[PDB]
Ligand binder design. Structure first.
Ligand code: CDL
Ligand code: CDL
Ligand code: CDL
Ligand code: CDL
Ligand code: PLX
Ligand code: PLX
Ligand code: PEE
Ligand code: PEE
Lengths: 69, 347, 56, 122, 459, 53, 55, 140, 104
């Protein structure tokens, strides 16, 4: 029965190790993502949560009929 | 109505919505809203009757008041900063006017009174349009100004919308009023998460629109507007009733159906922001919507109501007009839960 | 003689084929978790002169 | 509430930036694509059922078109989703690298020297 | 694990492509084959579980439940086909589809590695059961029963969803292995108290706990025979399995958060056993006996000892089999006389001797006669409770006495005395009914020879 | 929500009218042209969150 | 006394009664725009005072 | 206005029972006035005097509920020498519920209001103690 | 009409034994009934019960109980052959444990 239907314990052991590594890395990545999102939303210095401002290319830098703009 | 005129009016409604979508100037957004309302008023009155006239009048009054408040808020924002761009409003009073205006346009509580009456007073096609397409523009405007909203007022209106939608839907025998109260509750759910993640609002919008389109098309196919009229569909079109029952279960948010995913994502996103009490109340209140969906399913598909003798004559005739997208909408309303990670494409 | 009985009894292969496909997919899923094969401190071993992997 | 819409260098209406081409495309036997094809098949069957046609055999060309359209759309949907997740991870790692003072590496203690409280079950 | 799931899915097109007169035969044969295949999961490693992949795993707790579900499906099919003979082909296929979907959701629920997937499938089990109860139930109270069954479950389950997403946000994972290996104590605070309640009340109401049990008599009495079989045998065990999975992260709070639930369970098992003594409906008595047994299981889970979990697992399996057999026995008489009143048909031993033997064996297993697994689980739980507190023996003995009392009361009322004169439509027992009773009872007795298969991981 | 068709196509449908420092007819200046010019150039490209501070 | 009366009274019957009363209160409107717009004015006055003064 | 809530919360728990009772009475009166305004707007009272009477009854009931709750909670907190305890808020909430039941003259309403108002007040006290947020700020 | 509705009368349940005195209670068709009985009996009593019980009884000792007994025998022999205690009250070595230095 063991020869025909099952394998050795080492296969399941090492598969469990691989699964545990994957899950632990995913958990750490999730926590890191939450912290990074909090920091970017609080500070605004990252690529995320970038809210639009006025494009400086719209300004007309020409004389305006008056010396003082 | 001339078919050409109807096509022109529908295209004008859609073009006003798109003008609201693509504009960077507040005046152009106001113009889009005005054009949308102007082209929308005749569509509610396509089938002429006093009820349709009353519904159109109430709709016009509500939307015109909302537009006046919108313009007044825009003018205040201009006064306190010489800005026309829709980025983030610089005055709290102007922003409160803007929120109240957009909530009145959406029909959020306590500005919900017009939605059930207008929905009941019009045909099923006009009801479909009103409850699906008319939500896009104010929701887009709210998404653009999300960082400026006051969370207290928005969340209060959302919670009120959910509660009032459930309670009002508990008491209805007309199908259009049931759909209107369901729409109010879904709008409350959508606006609850907007201050935290606009992608969740967009996903909830897409799923709600799909389910509402499927439900309205199923109601048009079985030409019923009351509970007892829909009770006869089993004796003529059992497949339609079975699909209706499955879609109703999906609208109730039961897993593993599609309607569960927006609530699930909204709850988890709100818990990310240390918001625990309000999502709990929200789900416990959506239980009421599930209750009246289950009542409709009991009366429509799970049991067999008595029928009339003249149904035998209807047995001999097929449907002359067929809806092309009904099959796709049903599948998307039911079997899309395993495709959840695709929501990242929405941001 | 077999055409009609096949046409009326072909449904009896769906479940065994599903079982075979499930076993095949289970083996494929096993194939994706070989990161620690012959790497655990408890079962790390020297390969036989002819074997390529400790398990498959 | 709007995380990545304002990301710099974001073209408005591409649905697929050129940088996404550096990522491996999803395999044509991806289980998500198979599920999209199954959804298309279900749509075809429901279409047959509504129109009072033989559900399984009536429209073969229509069912083929349903499945093909669903698979075709799902391929690009999966590409965009994978690209968006890749962007998220890239930005997260870049931000972590550029701000070491907010993500410090503190020495980890072994369990023989960490004192945990014991709660007897009785 | 796919080798079990995929044939179960294949059961659907196979029954939808079958002839009008072959659906029952095909479904029964392939369900039995699937049960035979699923029987191979009992080979457990000891130290740790069988982790097939990232999504599914098998434990010494999950394997007996999976085997019980796979074995229960063919018995459900055998019991259903008698009262569904007048149905159309499409509706019979829809009923079988409901049963297959329920089996698929159950087998996926017991093997999920992550708690959100477990929650999704554990809620997904609701829809087929609700459809079965409200569509193929016999009486007009099935609608009210279905509403009770749905809303009692959901009112408890939604806070569990909120708690699960909060826990994943705070910890970073909900995978059961990571949850167990990175377990940290729960402090004594109101926030932790409400987290405990949100993690516990859903499984409490699924057991059901006394005071939250009102949905069970309605749903179990008003459902068709297959619905009652699956409700009593399997769906009640979801709460216990969820409790065993979830209490890993609840320590050390359970030390005092379990007091009201222990009090409710003990006194309510006494109350439901007493209720069984005065019952005019035969199915309600079986339902209330199920409530008492699940109260004992709740006590076993709450006290958090290895002997308690072993006894709880054994009692879950034994109760599932015994309750299914009792429901089938009641259904046979109901099909004979079209009434659920216990005193309507009396002295059935004179007319049906072999069915009377089945009744006697089922009643003996219900009262946990040694060395049946019912008494194995009950005795292990009672010993664990005695270790917890020596005063529990009073309530345990009272419950044992009342259980024997109503079990033999039901047996004597239904089988002994003289037959009712005017009832003259009691035909001899069919081969199907006797085979169904035998297929219920024989695994129960065979499990006595190998009790370690159902004792669970703590063995 | 906001499909930037103008930026994709380079159309300038309504951006000529958004600000007071943008190409008025006959070069007539706004009363606060210099202040708005300074504020716009300060806040350009750094995002709304930083622009406020 | 317990299962058929009081356990019924506390959890399910109380919920049904409360929801029925609230539904009757919410949904029984006369359909007059005068009352609706009066309530709209009341709501506007509240938002500008209980919310717009708090920032 | 939340300024009323701050004027209630600026006073310590077990000190100055009269001031805290006054603050709770003001909060209750404001709530009752809002309720009466909405009730008049949505259901006309068919006469000016009947509307005044309905406003008076609603406002007086709500103010009495607030007064009883605040007085009882402060008195229990100071007598028991147990500040930061949800039991005082539960006791005050049940007192307010009994007040409401006596006002409507209904034993069942009184008992239900006792139970639910006390549970809600205890939950509010727990949230104050552990810092639960109803309208949470968008931190992430 | 003094009636409320047009309804079929409730029919009497039909005895399977009336048309088939040996009908097994599986189906109205005698051939389908007989084959249903045969497949149920064969795939339940012959395949699942007996063969499955044999398979479960002869399951390999993956639970490591014989191994545990042999290991215990070896450890006991080694420990009482040298006068060592059979078991330590400490599960882990005190030399790899670093307690807090001061307790007051
Ligand atoms: C999770 C893992 C995967 C799970 C899969 C998901 C679930 C299943 C898939 C869902 C979608 C697929 C089917 C949808 C379209 C079908 C519509 C329909 O009505 O069917 C009629 C049709 C029978 O009609 P007919 O043959 O034309 O002639 C008879 C007359 O029409 C006479 O017919 P009639 O119309 O006159 O009869 C009247 C009847 C008509 O009423 C109905 O027929 C009910 C149809 C409801 C549509 C389902 C909703 C949409 C999908 C959402 C599913 C949700 C699932 C989540 C769980 C929630 C459960 C509700 O009305 C009633 O009797 C009242 C019933 C009311 C009781 C309430 C229950 C109804 C809802 C239950 C839905 C359960 C899910 C679908 C199950 C399959 C149903 C066919 O069914 C079929 O024959 C097709 C079924 C599938 C066959 C295709 C299989 C492929 C062939 C084998 C290839 C192998 C592939 C793999 C290769 C392996 C290598 C070898
Ligand atoms: C710290 C916070 C403190 C608590 C504040 C928050 C909690 C407020 C609870 C408010 C409870 C409202 C429900 C009460 C019953 C319904 C109204 C009613 O007529 O009852 C009659 C009922 C007697 O029955 P009845 O007159 O024989 O019934 C006649 C028919 O059977 C049936 O009567 P009917 O059909 O004539 O009903 C009247 C009518 C009229 O309907 C109403 O009166 C609804 C009233 C809602 C007011 C909400 C108050 C929230 C206050 C927020 C500001 C707080 C500032 C601080 O109903 C309708 O037409 C349908 C209503 C639903 C349609 C739309 C509703 C939404 C409108 C706006 C909702 C709220 C929006 C807020 C602003 C939103 C901005 C975004 O009770 C009364 O006589 C009046 C007394 C009500 C109890 C007051 C308890 C106050 C306790 C305060 C304690 C403070 C302790 C100190 C803390 C420190
Ligand atoms: C930028 C955004 C901001 C915008 C807001 C700013 C707005 C400023 C504009 C204001 C300038 C005036 C403009 C003129 C508008 C034209 C109105 C009109 O055409 O009347 C049509 C309307 C109906 O026309 P109709 O069909 O020809 O007449 C039929 C009969 O009326 C009906 O026949 P019936 O006799 O058979 O019916 C029975 C009787 C029933 O009448 C009643 O039952 C109402 C009397 C209740 C007595 C209230 C208690 C008194 C003491 C409370 C004081 C609070 C502090 C207490 C502190 C502690 C106390 C110890 O009548 C009614 O049903 C009508 C009810 C409506 C009453 C007023 C509506 C207000 C909201 C409803 C709540 C009612 C008061 C509750 C308490 C609320 C908080 C104060 O006429 C009226 O109902 C009243 C006459 C209008 C004169 C008063 C209007 C002034 C109020 C405007 C807003 C208030 C201040 C705004 C801002 C203040 C702070 C910033
Ligand atoms: C029925 C219809 C109605 C409803 C039915 C309901 C039931 C449904 C059942 C469903 C299916 C269940 C499936 C279960 C499968 C079980 C398989 C299993 O686990 O087998 C285990 C086990 C096999 O052991 P193993 O692990 O293979 O052993 C290997 C050894 O290492 C090495 O062993 P070894 O080298 O010693 O080899 C011995 C060898 C050779 O031994 C010998 O030949 C020597 C014997 C001594 C002979 C000495 C005299 C003869 C020679 C001298 C005379 C001639 C020459 C001298 C002439 C002189 C003239 C004056 O023969 C044997 O191995 C023993 C026989 C094994 C038979 C197993 C049969 C299992 C059947 C499973 C399915 C059953 C289905 C039911 C139908 C069964 C068929 C009817 O079989 C037994 O346990 C036999 C039990 C023996 C008990 C001994 C007495 C104990 C009494 C203690 C209690 C005292 C109180 C009174 C209690 C009374 C209780 C009766
Ligand atoms: C029909 C069946 C339904 C299901 C039954 C569910 C049972 C739920 C009951 C939960 C069990 C206990 C909950 C919390 C444990 C202790 C509760 C409290 O009474 O204990 C004292 C708490 O002190 C006070 O009593 C505060 C609670 C008073 C307010 C609660 C209202 C209780 C009234 C009963 C209402 C009914 C509730 C159920 C509704 C259905 C302990 O004193 P203290 O050491 O200082 O506080 C410990 C907490 N710390 C560490 C955070 C400080
Ligand atoms: C109607 C007429 C009645 C009269 C006729 C009666 C005839 C005699 C009846 C009495 C027979 C007594 C038999 C006594 C037992 C003898 C055999 C026994 O010793 O074998 C047992 C074997 O029992 C089985 O292992 C356990 C039974 C497994 C049951 C599985 C049932 C199949 C699944 C069906 C679905 C189940 C659904 C619920 C599951 C959770 C114990 O095995 P064990 O001593 O260790 O083995 C030692 C040697 N080994 C280990 C090498 C084998
Ligand atoms: C939480 C706050 C707690 C509020 C306490 C009041 C709750 C009472 C509900 C228990 C049931 C008691 C009862 O009898 O309900 C009746 C009572 C009306 O009086 P009757 O008894 O019907 O009149 C008798 C003569 N016809 O019901 C009601 O009107 C109140 C129902 C609404 C309860 C409040 C719900 C508010 C929800 C929104 C919160 C935000
Ligand atoms: C069908 C009958 C079944 C009924 C079961 C209902 C009971 C469910 C248990 C309570 C549900 C709410 C639990 C909330 C989810 C837990 C998440 C959590 O732990 O967050 C808490 C939040 O805790 C709460 O907010 C709980 C407040 C309660 C809100 C709703 C109250 C409703 C009534 C509660 C009592 C009833 C529950 C048990 C009754 C069982 C059924 C009778 C702490 O978070 P932080 O804010 O970050 O605090 C730490 C940092 N400062």
């Amino acid at each position: 029965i063991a020869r025909t239907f099952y394998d050795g314990p080492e296969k399941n052991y090492e598969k469990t190790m691989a699964i545990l590594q994957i899950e632990a890395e995913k958990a750490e990545l999730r926590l890191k993502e939450l912290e990074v999102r909090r920091l970017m939303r609080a500070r605004g210095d990252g690529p995320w949560y970038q809210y639009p401002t006025i494009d400086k290319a719209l300004i007309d830098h020409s004389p305006k009929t008056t010396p003082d703009n | 109505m001339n078919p050409i005129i109807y096509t022109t009016l529908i295209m004008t409604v859609m073009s006003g919505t798109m003008l609201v979508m693509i504009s960077s100037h507040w005046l152009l957004i106001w113009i889009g809203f005005e054009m949308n309302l102007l082209a929308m008023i005749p569509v509610l009155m396509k089938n002429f009757n006093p009820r349709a006239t009353e519904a159109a009048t109430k709709y016009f009054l509500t939307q015109a008041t909302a537009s006046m408040m919108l313009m007044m808020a825009i003018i205040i924002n201009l006064l306190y900063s010489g800005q026309w761009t829709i980025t983030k409003m610089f005055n709290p009073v102007a922003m409160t006017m803007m929120t109240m205006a957009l909530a009145m346009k959406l029909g959020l509580s306590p500005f919900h009174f017009w939605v059930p009456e207008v929905t009941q007073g019009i045909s099923l096609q006009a009801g479909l349009l009103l409850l699906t397409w008319q939500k896009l523009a104010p929701l887009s405007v709210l998404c653009q100004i999300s960082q400026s909203i006051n969370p207290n007022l928005m969340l209060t209106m959302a919670m009120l919308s959910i509660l009032i939608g459930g309670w009002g839907g508990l008491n209805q025998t007309q199908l259009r009023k049931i759909m209107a109260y369901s729409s109010i509750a879904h709008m409350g759910w959508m606006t609850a998460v907007l201050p935290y993640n606009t992608t969740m609002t967009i996903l909830n919008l897409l799923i709600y629109i799909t389910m509402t389109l499927a439900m309205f098309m199923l109601l048009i196919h079985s030409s019923a507007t009351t509970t007892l009229s829909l009770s006869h569909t089993w004796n003529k079109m059992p497949v339609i009733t079975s699909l209706m029952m499955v879609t109703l279960l999906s609208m109730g948010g039961l897993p593993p159906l599609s309607g569960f995913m927006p609530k699930w994502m909204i709850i988890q996103e709100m818990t990310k922001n240390e918001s625990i009490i309000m999502p709990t109340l929200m789900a416990m209140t959506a239980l009421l919507n599930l209750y009246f969906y289950m009542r409709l399913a009991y009366s429509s598909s799970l049991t067999m109501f008595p029928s009339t003798n003249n149904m035998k004559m209807k047995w001999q005739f097929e449907h002359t007009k067929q809806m092309k997208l009904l099959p796709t909408m049903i599948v998307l309303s039911t079997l899309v839960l395993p495709m959840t990670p695709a929501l990242s494409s929405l941001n | 003689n077999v055409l009609q009985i096949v046409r009326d009894h072909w449904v009896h292969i769906l479940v065994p084929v599903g079982f075979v496909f499930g076993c095949y997919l289970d083996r494929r899923s096993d194939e994706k978790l070989t990161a620690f094969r012959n790497k655990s401190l408890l079962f790390k071993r020297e390969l036989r002169p002819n074997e390529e992997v400790t398990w498959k | 509430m709007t995380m990545m819409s304002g990301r710099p260098g974001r073209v408005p209406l591409q649905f697929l930036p050129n940088e996404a081409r550096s990522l491996p495309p999803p395999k044509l036997t991806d289980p998500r694509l198979v599920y999209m094809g199954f959804l298309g098949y279900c749509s075809g069957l429901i279409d047959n059922a509504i129109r009072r046609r033989p559900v399984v055999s009536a429209g073969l060309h229509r069912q083929l078109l349903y499945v093909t359209s669903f698979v075709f759309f799902g391929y690009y949907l999966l590409k965009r989703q994978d690209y968006m997740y890749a962007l998220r991870d890239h930005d997260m790692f870049a931000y972590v690298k550029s701000h070491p003072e907010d993500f410090p590496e503190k020495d980890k203690k072994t369990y023989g020297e960490i004192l945990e409280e014991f709660h007897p079950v009785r | 694990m796919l080798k079990i799931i995929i044939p179960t899915t294949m059961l659907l097109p196979m029954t939808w492509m079958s002839k009008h007169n072959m659906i029952w035969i095909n479904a029964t044969v392939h369900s039995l084959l699937i049960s035979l295949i699923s029987l191979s999961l009992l080979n457990q490693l000891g130290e740790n579980s069988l982790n097939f992949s990232l999504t599914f795993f098998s434990d010494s707790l999950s394997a007996p439940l999976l085997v019980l579900t796979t074995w229960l499906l063919p018995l459900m099919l055998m019991a259903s086909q008698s009262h569904l003979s007048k149905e159309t082909t499409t509706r019979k296929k829809l009923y079988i589809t409901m049963l297959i979907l329920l089996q698929l959701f159950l087998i996926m629920t017991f093997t999920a590695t992550e708690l959100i997937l477990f929650y999704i499938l554990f809620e997904a089990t609701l829809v087929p059961t609700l459809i079965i109860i409200t569509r193929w139930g016999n009486q007009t109270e099935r609608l009210n029963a279905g509403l009770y069954f749905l809303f009692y479950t959901l009112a408890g389950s939604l806070p569990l969803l909120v708690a699960l997403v909060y826990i994943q946000n705070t910890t970073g994972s909900l995978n059961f292995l990571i949850i167990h290996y990175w377990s940290h104590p729960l402090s004594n605070s109101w926030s932790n108290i409400f987290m405990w309640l949100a993690c516990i009340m859903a499984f409490m109401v699924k057991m059901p706990l006394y005071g939250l049990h009102l949905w069970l008599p309605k749903a179990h009495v008003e459902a068709p025979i297959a619905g009652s079989m699956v409700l009593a045998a399997v769906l009640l065990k979801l709460g216990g399995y969820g409790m065993m999975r979830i209490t890993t992260i609840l320590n050390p709070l359970t030390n005092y958060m379990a007091y009201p639930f222990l009090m409710l369970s003990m006194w309510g098992m006494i109350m439901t056993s007493s209720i069984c003594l005065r019952q005019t409906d035969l199915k309600s008595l079986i339902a209330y006996s199920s409530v008492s047994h699940m109260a004992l299981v709740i006590v076993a889970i709450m006290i958090q000892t290895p002997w308690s979990f072993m006894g709880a697992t054994a009692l879950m399996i034994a109760h599932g089999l015994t309750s299914s057999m009792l429901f089938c026995l009641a259904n046979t008489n109901y099909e004979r006389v079209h009434s659920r009143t216990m005193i309507l048909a009396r002295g059935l031993q004179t007319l049906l001797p072999l069915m009377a033997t089945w009744w006697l064996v089922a009643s003996l297993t219900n009262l946990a006669l040694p060395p049946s697994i019912n008494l194995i689980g009950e005795l292990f739980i009672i010993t664990a409770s005695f270790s917890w507190s020596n005063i529990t023996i009073i309530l345990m003995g009272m419950n044992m006495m009342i259980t024997a009392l109503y079990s033999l009361y039901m047996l004597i009322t239904t089988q002994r005395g003289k037959y009712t004169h005017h009832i003259n439509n009691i035909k001899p027992s069919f081969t199907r009914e006797n085979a169904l009773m035998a297929l219920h009872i024989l695994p129960l007795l065979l499990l006595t020879l190998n009790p370690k298969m159902i004792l669970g991981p703590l063995y | 929500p906001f499909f930037d068709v103008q930026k994709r196509l380079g159309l300038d449908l309504d951006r000529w009218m958004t600000i007071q420092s943008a190409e008025q007819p006959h070069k007539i200046p706004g009363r606060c042209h210099a202040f708005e010019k300074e504020w716009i150039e300060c806040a350009h490209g750094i995002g709304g969150i930083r622009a406020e501070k | 006394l317990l299962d058929l009366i009081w356990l019924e009274t506390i959890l399910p019957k109380t919920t049904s009664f409360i929801q029925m009363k609230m539904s009757i209160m919410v949904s029984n409107q006369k359909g007059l725009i005068k009352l609706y717009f009066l309530s709209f004015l009341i709501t506007i006055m509240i938002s500008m005072t209980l919310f717009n003064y708090h920032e | 206005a939340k300024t009323l809530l701050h004027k209630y919360s600026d006073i310590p728990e077990g000190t100055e029972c009269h001031r805290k009772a006054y603050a709770s009475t003001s909060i209750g009166g404001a709530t009752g006035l809002i309720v009466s305004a909405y009730s008049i707007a949505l259901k006309p009272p068919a006469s000016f005097l009947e509307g005044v009477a309905r406003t008076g009854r609603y406002t007086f009931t709500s103010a009495a509920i607030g007064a009883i709750f605040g007085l009882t909670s402060c008195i229990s907190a100071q007598v028991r020498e147990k500040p930061d305890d949800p039991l005082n808020y539960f006791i005050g909430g049940c007192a307010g519920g009994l007040t409401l039941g006596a006002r409507t003259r209904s034993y069942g309403i009184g008992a239900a209001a006792c139970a639910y108002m006390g549970l809600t007040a205890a939950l509010v006290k727990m949230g104050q103690l552990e810092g639960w947020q109803v309208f949470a700020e968008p931190k992430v | 009409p003094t009636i409320r509705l047009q309804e079929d009368p409730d029919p009497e349940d039909e005895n399977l034994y009336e048309k088939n005195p040996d009908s097994h209670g599986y189906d109205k068709d005698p051939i389908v009934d007989l084959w249903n009985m045969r497949v149920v009996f064969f795939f339940g009593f012959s395949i699942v019960l007996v063969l499955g019980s044999t398979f479960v009884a002869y399951l390999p000792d993956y639970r490591m109980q014989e191994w545990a007994r042999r290991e215990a025998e070896r450890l006991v022999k080694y420990r009482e052959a040298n006068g060592l205690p059979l078991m330590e009250s400490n599960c882990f070595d005190p030399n790899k444990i670093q307690l807090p230095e001061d307790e007051d």
